[PDB]
Coordinates of C-alpha atoms in Angstrom, one line a residue:
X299 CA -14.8 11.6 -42.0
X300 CA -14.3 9.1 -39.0
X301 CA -14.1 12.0 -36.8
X302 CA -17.5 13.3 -37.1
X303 CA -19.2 9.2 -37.0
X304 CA -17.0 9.4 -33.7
X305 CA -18.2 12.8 -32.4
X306 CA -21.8 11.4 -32.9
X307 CA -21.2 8.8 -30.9
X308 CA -19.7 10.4 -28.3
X309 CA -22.0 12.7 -28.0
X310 CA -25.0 10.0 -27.4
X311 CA -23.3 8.8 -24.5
X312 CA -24.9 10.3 -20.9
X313 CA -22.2 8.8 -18.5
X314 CA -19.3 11.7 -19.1
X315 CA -19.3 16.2 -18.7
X316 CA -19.6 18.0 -22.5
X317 CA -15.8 19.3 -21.0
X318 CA -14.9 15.7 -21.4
X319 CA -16.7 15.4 -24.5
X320 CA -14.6 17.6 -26.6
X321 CA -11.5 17.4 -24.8
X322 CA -11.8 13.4 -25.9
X323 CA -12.9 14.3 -29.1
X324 CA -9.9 17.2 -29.2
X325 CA -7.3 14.3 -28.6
X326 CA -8.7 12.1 -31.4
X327 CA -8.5 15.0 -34.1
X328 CA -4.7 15.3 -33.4
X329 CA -4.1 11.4 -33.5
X330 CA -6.0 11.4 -36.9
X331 CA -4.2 14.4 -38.3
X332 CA 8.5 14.4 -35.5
X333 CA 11.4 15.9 -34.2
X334 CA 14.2 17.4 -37.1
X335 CA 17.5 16.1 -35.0
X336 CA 19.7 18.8 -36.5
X337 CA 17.4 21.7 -34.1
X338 CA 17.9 19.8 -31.0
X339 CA 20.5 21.4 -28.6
X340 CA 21.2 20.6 -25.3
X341 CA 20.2 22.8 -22.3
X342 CA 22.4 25.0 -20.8
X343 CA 23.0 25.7 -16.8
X344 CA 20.6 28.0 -17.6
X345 CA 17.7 26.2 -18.7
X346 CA 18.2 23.0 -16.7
X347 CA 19.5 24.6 -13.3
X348 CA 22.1 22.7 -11.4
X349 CA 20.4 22.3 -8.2
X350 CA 24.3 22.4 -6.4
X351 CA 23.7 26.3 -8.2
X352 CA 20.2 27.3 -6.2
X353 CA 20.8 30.3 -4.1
X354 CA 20.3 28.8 -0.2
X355 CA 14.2 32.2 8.7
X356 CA 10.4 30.4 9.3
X357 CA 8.3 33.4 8.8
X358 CA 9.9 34.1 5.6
X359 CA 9.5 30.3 4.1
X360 CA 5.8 30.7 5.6
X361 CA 4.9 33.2 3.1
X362 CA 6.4 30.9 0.0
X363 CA 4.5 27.5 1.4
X364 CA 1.4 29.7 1.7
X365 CA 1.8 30.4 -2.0
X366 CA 1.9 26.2 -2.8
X367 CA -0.3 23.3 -3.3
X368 CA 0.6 19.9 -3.3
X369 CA -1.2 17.7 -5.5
X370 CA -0.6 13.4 -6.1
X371 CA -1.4 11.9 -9.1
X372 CA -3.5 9.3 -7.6
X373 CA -5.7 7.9 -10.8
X374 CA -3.6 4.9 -10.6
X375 CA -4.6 1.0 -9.3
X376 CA -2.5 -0.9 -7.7
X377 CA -2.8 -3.8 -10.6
X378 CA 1.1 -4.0 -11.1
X379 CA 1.8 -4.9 -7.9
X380 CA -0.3 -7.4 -7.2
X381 CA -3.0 -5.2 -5.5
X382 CA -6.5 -3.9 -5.8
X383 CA -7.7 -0.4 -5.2
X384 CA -5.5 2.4 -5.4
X385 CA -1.6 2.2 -5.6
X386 CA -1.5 4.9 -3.2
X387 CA -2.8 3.0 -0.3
X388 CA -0.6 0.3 -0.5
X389 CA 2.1 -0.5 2.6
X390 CA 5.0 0.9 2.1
X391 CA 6.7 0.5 5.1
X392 CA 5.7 -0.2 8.9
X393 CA 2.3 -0.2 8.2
X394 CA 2.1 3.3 6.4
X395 CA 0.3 3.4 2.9
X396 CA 2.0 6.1 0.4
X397 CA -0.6 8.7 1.3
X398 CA 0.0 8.1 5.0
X399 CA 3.1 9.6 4.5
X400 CA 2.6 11.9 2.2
X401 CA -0.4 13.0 5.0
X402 CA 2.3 12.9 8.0
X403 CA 5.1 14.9 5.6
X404 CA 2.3 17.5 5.2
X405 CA 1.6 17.3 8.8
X406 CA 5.9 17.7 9.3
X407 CA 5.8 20.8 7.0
X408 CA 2.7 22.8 8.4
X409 CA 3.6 22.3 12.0
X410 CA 7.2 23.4 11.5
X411 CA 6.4 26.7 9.4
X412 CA 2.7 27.2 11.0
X413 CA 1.3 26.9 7.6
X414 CA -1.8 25.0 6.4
X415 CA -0.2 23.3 2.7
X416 CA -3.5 22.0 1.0
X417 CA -3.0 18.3 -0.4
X418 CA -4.9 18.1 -3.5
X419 CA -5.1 14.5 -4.8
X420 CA -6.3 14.1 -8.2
X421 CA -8.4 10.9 -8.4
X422 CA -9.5 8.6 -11.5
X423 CA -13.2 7.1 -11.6
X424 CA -11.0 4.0 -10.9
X425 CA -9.9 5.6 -7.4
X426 CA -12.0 8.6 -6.5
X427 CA -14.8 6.6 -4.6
X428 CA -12.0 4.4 -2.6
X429 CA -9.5 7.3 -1.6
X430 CA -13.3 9.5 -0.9
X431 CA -13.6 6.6 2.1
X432 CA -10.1 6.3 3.0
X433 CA -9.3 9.7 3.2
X434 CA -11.6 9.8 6.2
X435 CA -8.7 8.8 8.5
X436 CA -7.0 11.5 7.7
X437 CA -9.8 14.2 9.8
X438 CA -8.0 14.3 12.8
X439 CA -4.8 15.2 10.9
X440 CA -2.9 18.7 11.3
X441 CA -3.8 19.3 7.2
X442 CA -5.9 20.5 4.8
X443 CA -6.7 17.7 1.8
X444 CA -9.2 17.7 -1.2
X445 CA -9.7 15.2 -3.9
X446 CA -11.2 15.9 -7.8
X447 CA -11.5 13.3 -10.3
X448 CA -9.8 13.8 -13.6
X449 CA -11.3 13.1 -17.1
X450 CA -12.9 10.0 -17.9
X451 CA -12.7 9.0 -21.8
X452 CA -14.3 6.0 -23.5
X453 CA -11.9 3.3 -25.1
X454 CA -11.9 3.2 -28.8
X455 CA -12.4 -0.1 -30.4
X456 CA -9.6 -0.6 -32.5
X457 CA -11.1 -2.2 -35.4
X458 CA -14.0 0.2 -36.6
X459 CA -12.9 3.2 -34.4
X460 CA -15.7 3.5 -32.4
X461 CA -16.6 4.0 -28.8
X462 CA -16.5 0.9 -26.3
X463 CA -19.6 2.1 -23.8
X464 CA -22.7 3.1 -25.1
X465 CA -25.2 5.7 -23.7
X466 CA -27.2 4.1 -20.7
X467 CA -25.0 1.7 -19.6
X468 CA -22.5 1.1 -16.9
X469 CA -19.6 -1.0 -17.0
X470 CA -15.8 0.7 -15.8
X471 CA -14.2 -1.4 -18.6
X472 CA -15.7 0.9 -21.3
X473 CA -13.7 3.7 -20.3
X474 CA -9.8 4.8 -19.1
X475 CA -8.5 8.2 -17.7
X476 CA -6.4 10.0 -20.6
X477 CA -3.0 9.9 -19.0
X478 CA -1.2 12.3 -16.0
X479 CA -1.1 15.3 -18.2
X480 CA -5.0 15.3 -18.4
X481 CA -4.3 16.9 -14.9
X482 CA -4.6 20.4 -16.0
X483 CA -7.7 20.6 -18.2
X484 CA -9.2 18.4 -14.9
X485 CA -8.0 20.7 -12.6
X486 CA -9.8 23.6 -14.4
X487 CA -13.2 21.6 -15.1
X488 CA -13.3 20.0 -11.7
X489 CA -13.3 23.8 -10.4
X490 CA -10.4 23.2 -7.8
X491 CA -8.2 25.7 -10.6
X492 CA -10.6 28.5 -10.0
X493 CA -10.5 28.1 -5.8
X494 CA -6.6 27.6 -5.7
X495 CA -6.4 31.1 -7.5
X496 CA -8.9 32.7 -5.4
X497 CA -7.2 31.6 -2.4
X498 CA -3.7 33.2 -3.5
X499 CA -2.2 29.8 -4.4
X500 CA 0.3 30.1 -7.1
X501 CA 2.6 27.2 -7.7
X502 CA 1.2 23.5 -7.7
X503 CA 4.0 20.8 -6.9
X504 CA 3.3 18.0 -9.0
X505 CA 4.2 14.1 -8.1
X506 CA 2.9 10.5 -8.5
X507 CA 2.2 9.6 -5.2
X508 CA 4.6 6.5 -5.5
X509 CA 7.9 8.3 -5.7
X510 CA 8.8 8.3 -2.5
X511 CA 11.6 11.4 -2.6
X512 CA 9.0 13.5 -3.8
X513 CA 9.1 15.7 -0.5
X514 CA 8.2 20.1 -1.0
X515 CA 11.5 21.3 -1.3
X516 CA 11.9 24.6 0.3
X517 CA 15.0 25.8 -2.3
X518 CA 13.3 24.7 -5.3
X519 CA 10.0 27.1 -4.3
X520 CA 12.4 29.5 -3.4
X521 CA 13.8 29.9 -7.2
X522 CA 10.5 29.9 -9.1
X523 CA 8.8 32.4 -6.8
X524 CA 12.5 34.6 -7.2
X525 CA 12.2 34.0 -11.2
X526 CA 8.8 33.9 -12.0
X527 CA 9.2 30.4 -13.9
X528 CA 5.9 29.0 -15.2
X529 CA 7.0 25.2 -14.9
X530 CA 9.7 23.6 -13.9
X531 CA 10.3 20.0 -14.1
X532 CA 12.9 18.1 -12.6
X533 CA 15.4 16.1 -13.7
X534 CA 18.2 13.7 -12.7
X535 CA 21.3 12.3 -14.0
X536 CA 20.5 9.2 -16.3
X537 CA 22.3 5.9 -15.0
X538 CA 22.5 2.9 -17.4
X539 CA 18.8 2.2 -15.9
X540 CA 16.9 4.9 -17.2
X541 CA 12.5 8.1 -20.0
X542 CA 12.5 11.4 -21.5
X543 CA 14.4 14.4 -21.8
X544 CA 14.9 18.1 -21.4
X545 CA 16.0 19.8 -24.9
X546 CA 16.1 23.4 -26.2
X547 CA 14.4 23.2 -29.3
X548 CA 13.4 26.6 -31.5
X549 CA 14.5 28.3 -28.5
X550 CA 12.8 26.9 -25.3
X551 CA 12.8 23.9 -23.6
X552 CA 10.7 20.8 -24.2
X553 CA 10.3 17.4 -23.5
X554 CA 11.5 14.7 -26.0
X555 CA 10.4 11.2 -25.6
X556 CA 11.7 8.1 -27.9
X557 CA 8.3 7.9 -29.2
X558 CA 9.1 11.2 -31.2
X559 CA 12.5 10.7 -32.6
X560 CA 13.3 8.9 -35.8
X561 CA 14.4 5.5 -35.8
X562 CA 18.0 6.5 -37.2
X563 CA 18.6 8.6 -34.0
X564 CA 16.7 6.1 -31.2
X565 CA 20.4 4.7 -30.1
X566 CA 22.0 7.9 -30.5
X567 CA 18.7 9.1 -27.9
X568 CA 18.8 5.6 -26.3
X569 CA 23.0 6.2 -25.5
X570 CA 24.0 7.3 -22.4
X571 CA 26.8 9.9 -24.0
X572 CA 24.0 12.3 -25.7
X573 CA 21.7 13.1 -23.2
X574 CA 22.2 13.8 -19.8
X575 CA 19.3 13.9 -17.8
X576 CA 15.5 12.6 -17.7
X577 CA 12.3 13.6 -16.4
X578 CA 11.6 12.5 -12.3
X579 CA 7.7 13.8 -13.2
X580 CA 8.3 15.9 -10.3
X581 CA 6.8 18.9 -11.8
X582 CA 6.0 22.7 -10.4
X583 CA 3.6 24.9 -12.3
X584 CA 2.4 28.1 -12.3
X585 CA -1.9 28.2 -11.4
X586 CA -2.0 31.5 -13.3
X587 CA -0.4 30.0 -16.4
X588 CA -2.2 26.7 -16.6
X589 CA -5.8 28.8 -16.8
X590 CA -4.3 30.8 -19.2
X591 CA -3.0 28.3 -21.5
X592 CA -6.2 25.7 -20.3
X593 CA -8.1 28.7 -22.0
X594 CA -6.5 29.3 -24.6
X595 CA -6.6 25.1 -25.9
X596 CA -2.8 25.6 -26.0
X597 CA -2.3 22.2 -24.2
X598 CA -2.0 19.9 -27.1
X599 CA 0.7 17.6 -25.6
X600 CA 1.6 14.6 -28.2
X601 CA -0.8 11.6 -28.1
X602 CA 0.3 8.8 -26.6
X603 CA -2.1 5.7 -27.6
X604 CA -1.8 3.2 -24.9
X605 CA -3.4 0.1 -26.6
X606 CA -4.9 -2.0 -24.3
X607 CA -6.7 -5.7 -24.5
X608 CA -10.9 -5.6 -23.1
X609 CA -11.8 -9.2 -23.0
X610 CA -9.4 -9.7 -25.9
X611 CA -10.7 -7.1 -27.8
X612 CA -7.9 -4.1 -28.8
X613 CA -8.7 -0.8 -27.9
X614 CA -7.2 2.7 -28.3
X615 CA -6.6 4.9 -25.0
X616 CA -5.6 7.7 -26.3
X617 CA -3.7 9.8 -23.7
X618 CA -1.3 12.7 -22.7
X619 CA 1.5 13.4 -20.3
X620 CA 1.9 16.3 -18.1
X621 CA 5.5 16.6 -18.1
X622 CA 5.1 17.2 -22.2
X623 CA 3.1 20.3 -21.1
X624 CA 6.1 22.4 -20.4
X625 CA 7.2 23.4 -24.0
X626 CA 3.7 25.7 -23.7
X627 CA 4.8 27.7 -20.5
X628 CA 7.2 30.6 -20.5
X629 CA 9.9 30.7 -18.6
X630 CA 10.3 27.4 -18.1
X631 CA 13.1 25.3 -16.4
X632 CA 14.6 22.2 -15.6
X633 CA 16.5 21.4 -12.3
X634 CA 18.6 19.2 -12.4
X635 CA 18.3 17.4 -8.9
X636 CA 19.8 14.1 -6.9
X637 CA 18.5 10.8 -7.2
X638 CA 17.1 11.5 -3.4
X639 CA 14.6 12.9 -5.3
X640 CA 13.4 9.5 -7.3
X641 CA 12.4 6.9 -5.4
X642 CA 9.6 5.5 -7.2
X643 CA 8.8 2.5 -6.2
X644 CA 7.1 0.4 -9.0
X645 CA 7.9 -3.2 -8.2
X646 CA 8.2 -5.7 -5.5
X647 CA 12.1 -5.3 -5.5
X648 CA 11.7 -1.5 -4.8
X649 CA 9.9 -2.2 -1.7
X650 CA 12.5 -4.9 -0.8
X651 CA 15.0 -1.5 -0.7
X652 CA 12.8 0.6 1.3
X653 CA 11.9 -2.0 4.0
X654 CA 14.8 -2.8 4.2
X655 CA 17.3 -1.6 6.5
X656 CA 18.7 0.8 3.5
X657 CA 16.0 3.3 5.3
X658 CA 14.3 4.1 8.2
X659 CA 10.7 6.4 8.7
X660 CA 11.5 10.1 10.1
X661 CA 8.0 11.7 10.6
X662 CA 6.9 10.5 7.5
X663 CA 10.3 10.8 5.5
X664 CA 12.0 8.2 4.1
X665 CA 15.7 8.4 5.2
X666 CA 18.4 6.7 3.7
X667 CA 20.4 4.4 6.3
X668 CA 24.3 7.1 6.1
X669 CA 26.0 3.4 7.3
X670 CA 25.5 2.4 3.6
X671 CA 29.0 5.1 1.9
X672 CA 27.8 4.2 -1.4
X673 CA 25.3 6.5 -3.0
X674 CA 23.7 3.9 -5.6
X675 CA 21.5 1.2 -4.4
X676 CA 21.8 -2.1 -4.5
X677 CA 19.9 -3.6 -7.8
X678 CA 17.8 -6.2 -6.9
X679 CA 15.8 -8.6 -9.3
X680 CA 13.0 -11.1 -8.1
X681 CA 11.2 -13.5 -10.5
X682 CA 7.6 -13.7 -10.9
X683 CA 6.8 -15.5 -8.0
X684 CA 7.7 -12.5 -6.2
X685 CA 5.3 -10.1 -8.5
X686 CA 2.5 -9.6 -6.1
X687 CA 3.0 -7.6 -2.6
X688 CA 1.4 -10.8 -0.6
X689 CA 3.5 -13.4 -2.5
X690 CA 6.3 -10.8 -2.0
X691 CA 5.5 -10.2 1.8
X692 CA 4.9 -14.3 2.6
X693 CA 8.3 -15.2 0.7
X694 CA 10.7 -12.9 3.3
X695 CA 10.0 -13.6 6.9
X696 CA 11.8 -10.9 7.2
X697 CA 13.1 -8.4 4.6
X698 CA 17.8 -9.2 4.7
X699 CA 20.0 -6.7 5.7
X700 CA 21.2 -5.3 2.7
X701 CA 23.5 -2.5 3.0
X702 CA 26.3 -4.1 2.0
X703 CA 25.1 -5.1 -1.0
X704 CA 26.0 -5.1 -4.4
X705 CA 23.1 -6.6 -6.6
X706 CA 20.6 -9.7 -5.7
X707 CA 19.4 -11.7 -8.5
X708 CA 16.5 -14.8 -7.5
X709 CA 14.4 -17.2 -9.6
X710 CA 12.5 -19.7 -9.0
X711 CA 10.6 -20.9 -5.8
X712 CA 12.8 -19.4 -3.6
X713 CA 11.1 -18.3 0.3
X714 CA 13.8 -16.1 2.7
X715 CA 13.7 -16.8 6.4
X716 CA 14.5 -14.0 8.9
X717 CA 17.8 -12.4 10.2
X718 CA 18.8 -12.8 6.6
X719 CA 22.7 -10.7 5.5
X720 CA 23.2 -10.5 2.1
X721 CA 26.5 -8.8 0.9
X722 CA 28.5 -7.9 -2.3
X723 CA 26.8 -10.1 -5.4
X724 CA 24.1 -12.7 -4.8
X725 CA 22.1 -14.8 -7.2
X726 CA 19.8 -17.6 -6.1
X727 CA 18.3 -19.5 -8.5
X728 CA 16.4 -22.6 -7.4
X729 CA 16.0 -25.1 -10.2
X730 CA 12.3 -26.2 -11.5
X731 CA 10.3 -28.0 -8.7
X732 CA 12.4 -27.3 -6.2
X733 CA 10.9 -24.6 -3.1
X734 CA 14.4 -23.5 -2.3
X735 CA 14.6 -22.3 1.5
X736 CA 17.4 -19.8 2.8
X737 CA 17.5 -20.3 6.3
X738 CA 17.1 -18.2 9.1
X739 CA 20.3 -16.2 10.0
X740 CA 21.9 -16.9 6.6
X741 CA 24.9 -14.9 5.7
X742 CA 25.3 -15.0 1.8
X743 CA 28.0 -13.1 0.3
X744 CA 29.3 -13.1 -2.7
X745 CA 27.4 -16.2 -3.5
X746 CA 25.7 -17.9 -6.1
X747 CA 23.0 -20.6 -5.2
X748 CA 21.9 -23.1 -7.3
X749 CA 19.8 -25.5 -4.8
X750 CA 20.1 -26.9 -1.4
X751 CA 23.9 -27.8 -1.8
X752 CA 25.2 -24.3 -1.8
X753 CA 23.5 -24.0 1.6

């Protein structure tokens, strides 16, 4: 039995809760330990709501944002994107981090409605002690915020299945934080469950603190306190882009991800024609419930291993996702809502879009620039050199006026002046060794560069 060496090990070690103990140890009994296609039917308006369908006073919409929470996932680094410390406190746009808007949006919403929304931020060991200091700028702010760090497991050393860290010893790299839906055992042993509940808070409004459209939205509240839905996850149309899905399977809803279906049906999941709609990870959930079902060990999401490389060594990270919850909760929905609602941004290119001038700051919103007719964005594709937010920020003196256009492709050593138009399609692509220079005021459209002569 490999479990039980592993549970002896684990149990040795002095640096993690018992709670986190056997919740790690939980996770590796069902990876130890499939969909069947023909079951799988897809929602109805019913179970994935339209949100065109949702049935449309301050002192009333005081009483339902005095019933909700708004919690970040915020375990995340900034590593991606070319940053240290957490991804939340990156720029995003005229000097605001992520959570500075997310703080002022809070700020919007309680002075509008005289309401005090609590932000709950859910740190990692990888964050908590950062976003602990930063959040001190926020004390002057017209809100209420709290932070609780989520579960810490150990890696597993892939070859003889044991822990990496050892009792005694420090040493982050040991050690990972078992995925976003580790977010309700956390909130629960952190305590912050039992004080939400005690306080008469009843939904918490779920979101990674990077998607940007991730705003409260006063309609979607509306329906689960009218309903009495225990989760509700969001979804929006899939473009040729896009994740997981909402299904009815054995008569509820759940989560499918390609990870469970059978390779003879991962095109047929893959194609656009099938399935309609994936998951945002904008997610609303019932407190009551998620003690209920924390207590009961009904959580057992699927395991989602997550190998990783320590100093070349493989390890296992075994992990679960929070969206994958929702086939526990009763009553559960999806809403089915407009891209407005995901704008995550997760590369260089995506902050291109949002400082650009496709959007403008609103007391903390992000607003989309109504001078651009066309719904979609423009898709924009940058080459490595353009990976990291400094190299990103050095190589656009300014950031072009996009909002005419169609798709921008560029490789190589390319570095953007300022007062930069780019319209319809563009490609730059300057040629090995050469540090290609687009020159202030440029107008490109409907160009392809190659080097210095098609400038």
């Amino acid at each position: 039995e490999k479990l039980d060496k592993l549970r002896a090990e684990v149990a040795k070690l002095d640096q993690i809760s018992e709670n986190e103990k056997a919740g790690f140890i939980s996770l590796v009994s069902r990876y130890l330990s499939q969909i069947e296609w023909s079951k799988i039917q897809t929602p109805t308006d019913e179970v994935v709501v339209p949100y065109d369908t949702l049935a449309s006073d301050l002192e009333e919409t005081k009483k339902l944002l005095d019933k909700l929470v708004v919690l970040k996932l915020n375990g995340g680094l900034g590593t991606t994107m070319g940053c240290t410390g957490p991804k939340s406190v990156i720029e995003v746009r005229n000097g605001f981090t992520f959570l500075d808007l997310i703080v002022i949006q809070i700020e919007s919403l309680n002075k509008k409605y005289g309401c005090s929304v609590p932000l709950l931020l859910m740190n990692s060991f990888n964050t908590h002690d950062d976003t602990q200091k930063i959040v001190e700028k926020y004390s002057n702010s017209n809100i209420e915020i709290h932070t609780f760090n989520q579960s810490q497991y150990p890696r597993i050393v892939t070859e003889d299945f044991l822990p990496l860290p050892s009792k005694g010893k420090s040493g982050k790299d040991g050690w990972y934080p078992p995925g976003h839906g580790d977010v309700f055992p956390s909130l629960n042993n952190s305590g912050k469950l039992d004080i939400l509940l005690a306080q008469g808070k009843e939904y918490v409004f779920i979101a990674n603190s990077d998607n940007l459209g991730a705003i409260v939205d006063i309609k979607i509240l509306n329906h689960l306190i009218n309903n009495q839905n225990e989760y509700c996850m969001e979804v929006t149309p899939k473009t040729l882009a896009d994740g997981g899905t909402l299904i009815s399977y054995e008569g509820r809803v759940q989560l499918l991800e390609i990870a469970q279906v059978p390779d003879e049906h991962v095109n047929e999941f893959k194609s656009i024609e099938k399935f309609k709609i994936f998951n945002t990870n904008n997610l609303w959930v019932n407190l009551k419930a998620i003690k209920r079902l924390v207590e009961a060990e009904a959580l057992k999401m699927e395991i989602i291993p997550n190998p990783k490389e320590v100093d070349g060594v493989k390890v296992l990270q075994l992990e679960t996702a929070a969206g994958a919850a929702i086939r526990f909760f009763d009553k559960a929905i999806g809403i089915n809502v407009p891209r407005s609602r995901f704008l995550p941004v997760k590369a260089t290119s995506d902050l291109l879009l949002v400082q650009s001038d496709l959007y403008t700051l609103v007391d903390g919103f992000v607003i989309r620039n109504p001078a651009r007719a066309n719904p979609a964005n423009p898709s924009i594709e940058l080459g490595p050199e353009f990976k990291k937010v400094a190299n990103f920020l050095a190589r656009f003196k300014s950031i072009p006026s996009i909002v005419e256009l169609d798709s921008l492709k560029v490789s190589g050593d390319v570095w953007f002046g300022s007062g930069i138009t780019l319209k319809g399609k563009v490609t730059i692509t300057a040629k090995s060794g050469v540090k290609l220079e687009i020159p202030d005021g440029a107008v490109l459209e409907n160009k392809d560069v190659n080097g210095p002569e098609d400038l």
